[PDB]
Paper text:
LTA4H is a widely expressed bifunctional zinc metalloenzyme with epoxide hydrolase and aminopeptidase activities using the same Zn2+ in the active site. LTB4 is a metabolite of arachidonic acid (AA) in which leukotriene A4 (LTA4) hydrolase (LTA4H) catalyzes the final step in LTB4 biosynthesis. LTA4H is a bifunctional zinc metallopeptidases, which cleaves the endogenous chemotactic Pro–Gly–Pro that has a role in aminopeptidase activity, leading to the resolution of inflammation, whereas the epoxide hydrolase activity of LTA4H plays a role in the generation of LTB4, a potent chemokine for neutrophils. During the hydrolysis of LTA4 into LTB4, the Zn2+ of LTA4H binds to the 5, 6-epoxide moiety of LTA4 and initiates the chemical reaction in which the introduction of water occurs distant (C12) from the epoxide ring (C5/C6) and a unstable cis double bond is generated at ∆6 (between C6 and C7) in LTB412.
In the present study, we first report that bufexamac is a selective inhibitor of LTA4H, a crucial enzyme in the LTB4 biosynthesis pathway. Bufexamac significantly inhibited the activities of LTA4H aminopeptidase and epoxide hydrolase with the IC50 values of 15.86 and 11.59 μM, respectively. A high resolution crystal structure of LTA4H complexed with bufexamac was resolved to reveal the interaction between bufexamac and LTA4H. Structural elucidation of the interaction of bufexamac with LTA4H revealed that the carbonyl and hydroxyl groups of bufexamac were bound to three key residues (Glu296, Glu318 and Tyr383) and the Zn2+ in the active site of LTA4H, blocking the access to the substrate channel of the active site. Bufexamac also interacted with Tyr267 by a pi-pi interaction. The investigation into the structure of LTA4H complexed with bufexamac revealed that bufexamac competitively bonded to Zn2+ in the active site, thus preventing the approach of endogenous substrate LTA4. In this study, we observed that bufexamac exhibits dual inhibition activities against LTA4H aminopeptidase and epoxide hydrolase. Thus, the unexpected inhibition of the aminopeptidase activity of LTA4H provides a novel insight into the mechanism of allergic contact dermatitis caused by bufexamac.
Author numbering: 4 to 610
Write the structure that this text describes.
Amino acid sequence: VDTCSLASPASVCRTKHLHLRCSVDFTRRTLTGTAALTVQSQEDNLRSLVLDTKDLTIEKVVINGQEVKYALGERQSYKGSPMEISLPIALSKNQEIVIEISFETSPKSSALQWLTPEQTSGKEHPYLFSQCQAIHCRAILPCQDTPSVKLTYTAEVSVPKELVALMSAIRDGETPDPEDPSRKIYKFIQKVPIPCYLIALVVGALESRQIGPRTLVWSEKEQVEKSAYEFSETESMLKIAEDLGGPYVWGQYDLLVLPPSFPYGGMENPCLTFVTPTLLAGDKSLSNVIAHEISHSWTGNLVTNKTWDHFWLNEGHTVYLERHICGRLFGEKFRHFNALGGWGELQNSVKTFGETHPFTKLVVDLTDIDPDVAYSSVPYEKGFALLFYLEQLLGGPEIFLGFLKAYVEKFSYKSITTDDWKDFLYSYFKDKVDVLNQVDWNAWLYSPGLPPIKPNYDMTLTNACIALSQRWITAKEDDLNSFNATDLKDLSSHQLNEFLAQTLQRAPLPLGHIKRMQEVYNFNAINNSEIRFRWLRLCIQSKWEDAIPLALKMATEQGRMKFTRPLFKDLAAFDKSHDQAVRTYQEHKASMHPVTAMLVGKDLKVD
Ligand SMILES: CCCCOc1ccc(CC(=O)NO)cc1
Ligand SMILES: [Yb+3]
Ligand SMILES: [Yb+3]
Ligand SMILES: [Yb+3]
Ligand SMILES: [Zn+2]
């Protein structure tokens, strides 16, 4: 049972295709159009069905050229409102019909952010983007909003003619709009069956530049050159990923760099990965986010979680593949470094939620829980840890990659649960079942807290980070003079980041240590968003008032939740910055992404 959806389940009927015709209205902040769903009955004598919607205005429902009866049930919070549709003729099993729904979105759609000209780089044109994962596609169009159902789609999108529309699909041409010559119609086709969470749309003043044989980068003009360089390892990562996962089935692999309010690092929208501009460090140092999104082209997008309870399938495998991509490019020692980092991030989350908290389980029960609220590092890092543990248990990365490739082939184009995975794992490694039965499955899959076993990690690149962190934690005032810019000379940006992560785990430090740190290392000057994030948190937690304006500025000039939520939270826990944090949130809230605005609100306990 998909407890996040109110639609008829896949055992009742299945959407096979969506044909979307819509118009982007920036004056009203509405998408208006029709969604034509090809629905296949899985039951005899099917006479009605239910779709998910959220803040949608329904004009009418047409089947076989006539209007039919439908009703909208009462709103169930974050899930939206169920739309029951009365079919004009009962369907037999496997019979397909086309249901055409005339609809309009609310300007408050949780799927969308509408940005004025002034919130953009160019300042002349407005901009729209979507984000459907997990359950926001229902706030764009009526659908069975569950990853247990996969469909193909085609779409025609009318926008002001100076702007460009893109979607999670192959571009299928453009023409002037016949009903309105100030407008253009862009067309799209996604021939590979996808869950509806992977439907994506951006409209804006976009330009493109080619950076590989199957990759354009898109952004506003101001960010094009920088983006093309930042993501130039993209084709080499695709070739590695194809080696590990099998053929890339999606045609194009394009990247879109969003405005700073994009709430996540990246979103694996098929044919068109969306990424945060906070990746634009200038040195390709945050490209592991690209490797991750690329990896979703197999784990997630081809093999998909049947419900959001099994989100770890999607993320943990993706992190496992990601780290392999980075290990092939940068060395196995770097894969171990990144893995060990991930463990530290898992320790942080577990500490934050509490070691008995239900959201620290690998398989989570989402009944009555908003997926946005449960969202954390856990499914990424506990999932990765489980798979790295298995790798070590079963004979090494070469053997485990053979399983992962067979897993992808096996479950391509399907949606699966943790039991499906587990049973395939047992089938594939049947000569090592004895080893597998040593695994504490109940603990790994269903218990809260840190996993019962920690894998083994190479320490080569981590040692320097720990040693410097330890020098600073154990320093007294009379040791502060011995620190110097030369301490950093052999450290990469990744190692600088891990030094701060290590230090931050023991925060607060004395204020005079943090001041010395700025004096000798000049972390204030670093623009790498990961480093800057962790440094500013370290400042605020150690009660440095000078860091307040810097933290507020970072929290609000970009909107990547990973950064914005802990920055606001730290600012709200510091008594000197508390009132300003809340004031700043209230002032920015209307111009924030709707999900981000919601979550920052809960974190700060303000309404
Ligand atoms: C329950 C899930 C809700 C949040 O959705 C999302 C969570 C994370 C991402 C980034 C990435 O590629 N890994 O996920 C994108 C959407
Ligand atoms: Yb075509
Ligand atoms: Yb039209
Ligand atoms: Yb302000
Ligand atoms: Zn992911």
